[PDB]
Amino acid sequence: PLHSIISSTESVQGSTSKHEFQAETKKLLDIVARSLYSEKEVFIRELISNASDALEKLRHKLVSALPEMEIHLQTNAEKGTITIQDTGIGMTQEELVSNLGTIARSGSKAFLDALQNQAEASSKIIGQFGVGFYSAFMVADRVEVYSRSAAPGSLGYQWLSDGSGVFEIAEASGVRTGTKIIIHLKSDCKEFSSEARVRDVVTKYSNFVSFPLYLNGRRMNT
Amino acid sequence: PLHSIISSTESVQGSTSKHEFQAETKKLLDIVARSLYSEKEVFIRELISNASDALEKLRHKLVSDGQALPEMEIHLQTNAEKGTITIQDTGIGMTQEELVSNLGTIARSGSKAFLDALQNQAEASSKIIGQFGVGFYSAFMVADRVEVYSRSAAPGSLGYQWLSDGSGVFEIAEASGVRTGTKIIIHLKSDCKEFSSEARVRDVVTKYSNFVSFPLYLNGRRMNT
Numbered sequence: 001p002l003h004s005i006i007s008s009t010e011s012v013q014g015s016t017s018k019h020e021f022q023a024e025t026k027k028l029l030d031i032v033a034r035s036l037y038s039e040k041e042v043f044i045r046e047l048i049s050n051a052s053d054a055l056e057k058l059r060h061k062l063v064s065a066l067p068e069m070e071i072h073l074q075t076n077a078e079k080g081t082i083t084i085q086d087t088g089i090g091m092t093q094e095e096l097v098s099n100l101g102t103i104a105r106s107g108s109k110a111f112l113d114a115l116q117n118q119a120e121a122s123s124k125i126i127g128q129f130g131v132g133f134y135s136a137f138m139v140a141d142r143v144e145v146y147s148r149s150a151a152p153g154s155l156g157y158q159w160l161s162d163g164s165g166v167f168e169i170a171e172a173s174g175v176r177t178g179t180k181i182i183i184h185l186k187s188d189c190k191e192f193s194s195e196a197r198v199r200d201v202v203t204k205y206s207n208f209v210s211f212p213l214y215l216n217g218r219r220m221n222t
Numbered sequence: 223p224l225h226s227i228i229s230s231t232e233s234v235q236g237s238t239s240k241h242e243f244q245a246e247t248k249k250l251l252d253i254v255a256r257s258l259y260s261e262k263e264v265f266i267r268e269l270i271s272n273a274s275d276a277l278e279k280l281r282h283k284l285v286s287d288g289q290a291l292p293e294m295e296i297h298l299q300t301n302a303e304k305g306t307i308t309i310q311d312t313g314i315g316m317t318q319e320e321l322v323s324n325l326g327t328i329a330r331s332g333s334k335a336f337l338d339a340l341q342n343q344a345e346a347s348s349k350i351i352g353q354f355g356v357g358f359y360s361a362f363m364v365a366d367r368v369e370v371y372s373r374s375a376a377p378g379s380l381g382y383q384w385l386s387d388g389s390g391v392f393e394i395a396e397a398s399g400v401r402t403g404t405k406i407i408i409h410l411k412s413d414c415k416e417f418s419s420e421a422r423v424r425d426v427v428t429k430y431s432n433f434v435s436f437p438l439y440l441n442g443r444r445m446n447t
């Protein structure tokens with residue numbers, strides 16, 4: 001008896017605002033693109049860790065009907081997608097622009113510094129530091145984010161990028177509070193639209209995931 | 223958005239077997255029913271504690287054996303029209319043998335202590351029901367009639383309905399459409415219809431919901447972290 005919250009409720013309303021990635025972000029993305037980094041499956045944990053962070057942030061707002069606090073994965077073999085949705089704190093428009101566009105992540109500063117100071121392949125250095133959210137672009141043709149801040153009266157947004165130069169933001173209706181990230185997989189990365197492949201990855205660490213984690217409606221952790 | 227699992231999926235398929243309560247159980251029922259004990263709301267925690275126990279038992283069966291994990295939740299629902307309050311858990315459930323033995327006897331240790339203390343002391347039942355509790359039979363503080371469905375988590379298990387009006391006898395019959403775990407439907411006495419009010423149940427449960435070890439819902443609303 002399965003438990004799913006992921007469905008196509010969202011629709012883009014009105015016009016698009018166009019944004020450029022920070023220079024350092026473009027550099028990071030290009031390095032990832034042209035690296036031969038083989039453990040691309042890391043993007044799943046990067047996104048689950050972010051979902052967990054967002055749910056933890058939501059707790060900080062609680063005092064004495066509690067909000068649902070869940071992380072959902074869904075694979076779609078036919079569409080070549082993998083989706084992660086959390087019911088956590090979400091992002092304002094300002095937050096989308098800043099958080100998904102810059103190199104604020106402390107590990108990513110360390111990463112970029114390591115590129116200058118280590119006589120190692122980039123793949124090894126990606127292994128050492130990680131690249132956080134941008135790990136999605138290991139596997140994605142295109143990344144499609146919907147987010148709505150848990151703050152009352154906040155609007156929903158769509159953030160779009162193919163990971164080259166530019167990202168877009170538009171207002172969206174039908175966005176649940178929290179964040180949904182839809183990864184449109186590369187033609188050579190379709191393995192991550194398979195339930196079995198994703199289960200095998202996530203099983204290795206689901207016991208360490210602090211919130212309820214579902215894969216295609218099936219509960220993965222205690 | 224609400225989260226509810228409680229609905230009328232069950233129906234009796236099997237013959238009815240009628241059972242007499244053990245004499246000591248009859249005696250405890252008798253004592254509790256007639257008591258001036260006024261803190262009747264306790265039955266709600268009694269049932270939630272049992273739901274929790276059942277869900278904890280289900281954990282003990284889990285191993286890292288591949289698949290999904292079972293949902294582990296406790297649900298309360300009130301129905302003001304029908305004069306009911308229902309509690310459903312998705313835990314270990316009860317075999318037929320377990321229904322007859324577990325809901326039928328006074329194995330419970332605090333109930334043996336209760337009866338001992340009532341006999342060999344001069345405190346009235348009011349007090350010492352509060353001290354000891356009377357577990358599952360607390361339901362008969364507030365119930366005209368108690369309606370239980372249960373199916374054991376054990377592979378192969380059938381579903382059963384257990385019925386009692388709390389006087390002398392209980393019935394059991396095989397039932398279809400029982401989810402693994404236990405649903406308890408309390409058909410409330412006339413002077414007890416307050417426990418079919420959501421606000422009444424909420425105000426009671428809020429006092430201890432953050433000590434409840436599993437997700438707890440009231441009419442589809444989450445009550446605890």
Ligand SMILES: Nc1ncnc2c1ncn2[C@@H]1O[C@H](COP(=O)(O)OP(=O)(O)NP(=O)(O)O)[C@@H](O)[C@H]1O
Pocket residue numbers: 046049050051053054086088089090091099100105106107131132133134178179
């Ligand atoms: N699911 C999400 N919900 C809300 N905020 C998000 C989500 N995913 C990413 N973010 C924002 O994007 C930022 C960057 O994410 P990420 O690149 O993983 O770095 P980080 O999580 O800050 N640090 P690290 O612990 O090294 O991953 C986060 O700090 C959040 O502010």
Ligand SMILES: Nc1ncnc2c1ncn2[C@@H]1O[C@H](COP(=O)(O)OP(=O)(O)NP(=O)(O)O)[C@@H](O)[C@H]1O
Pocket residue numbers: 268271272273275276311313314315316324325330331332356357358359403404
């Ligand atoms: N929801 C339930 N699911 C499974 N078994 C149940 C359920 N409720 C009651 N039982 C069984 O009925 C027995 C009696 O319950 P109860 O009268 O509360 O005593 P107890 O729970 O054993 N001891 P105490 O800790 O004092 O409540 C339990 O031990 C269970 O075996």
Ligand SMILES: [Mg+2]
Pocket residue numbers: 046049050132133
């Ligand atoms: Mg992160």
Ligand SMILES: [Mg+2]
Pocket residue numbers: 268271272357358
């Ligand atoms: Mg008990």
